[PDB]
Amino acid sequence: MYVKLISSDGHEFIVKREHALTSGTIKAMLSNETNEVNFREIPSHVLSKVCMYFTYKVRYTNSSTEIPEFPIAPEIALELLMAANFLDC
Amino acid sequence: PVLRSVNSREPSQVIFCNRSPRVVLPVWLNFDGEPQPYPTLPPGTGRRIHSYRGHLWLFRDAGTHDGLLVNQTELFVPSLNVDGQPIFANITLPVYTLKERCLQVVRSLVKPENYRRLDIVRSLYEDLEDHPNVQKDLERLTQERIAHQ
Amino acid sequence: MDVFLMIRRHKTTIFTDAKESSTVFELKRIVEGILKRPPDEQRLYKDDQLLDDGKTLGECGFTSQTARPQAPATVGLAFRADDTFEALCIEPFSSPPELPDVMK
């Protein structure tokens, strides 16, 4: 139930399948090796933040707990936007 | 406008509880369903306010007009106070899509006139320019209400 | 209390949660399940401080305030190749580009 998302700079991110499936693009891509997706255009400083968003989304969706902000540093905002648009999440 | 406050004249005491990191703008939908701004609530603050049964509220970020939830939904309607207990209106962040959260941060960093200067696909220019606004959200909620009705 | 972690060795990062009350050794077991390497071939680090197998994640400094879903705490990982353990090497993530003019 764990899948591998690999960045352009060859960083390997191992996340729960249910988490990665937050992205309709990653769902379609799971349909590299089995349970591996290569992102030729997403570097590690962006994909690490996408994986953090997955964790955040699954934890706080339909939670009655107080929801904290998802923080985005200005220097990654534009790249994370382009990633978010591509991944549809 | 089907989304309007009912002119009940039935007093209802409410606690507006800001459980978000945002400065909250309370918005009252008047008897013509037109949105009226009320005094802002800083993050982690609460206020006891005087409202009425069948009155309609939504809550937005005071600066950006980003959508917020109240008791985990879009709209808040004060009911009859039981046993002199106020109705709690717990205002929270929704779980924004990563795209919407990215659009929020980019808007906060770049002046609208400079959106077109960003090295991004045209479709994302239009997405940046499509600022959250109460009027558009009220229409979707008006269709969601008729859909259930 | 749930803590949210990034377990990091070389160019590998595992995103996972565990209990604040759970042990460093019990995390090595989660790592074994994913990376197929036994706990006795694992060392875990917080910064450059080696973590003792008995200590809880709470006692190691991983709590609600340091290990959040949107801001997870980094756990270092070094494997033992046959004889001796390797030196802790976490490859940093890429550096973001210079802020565009219109964002300054």
Ligand SMILES: Cc1ncsc1-c1ccc(CNC(=O)[C@@H]2C[C@@H](O)CN2C(=O)[C@@H](n2cc(C3CC3)nn2)C(C)(C)C)cc1
């Ligand atoms: C401090 C603070 N911080 C954050 S928000 C806040 C704050 C401050 C003041 C009040 C006073 N209450 C109202 O204005 C209510 C609120 C809504 O239910 C319409 N109200 C009305 O009073 C309206 N009304 C009055 C009536 C009377 C016939 C019963 N019907 N509607 C009108 C406008 C006078 C038209 C409430 C909240």
Ligand SMILES: [Cl-]
């Ligand atoms: Cl913001």
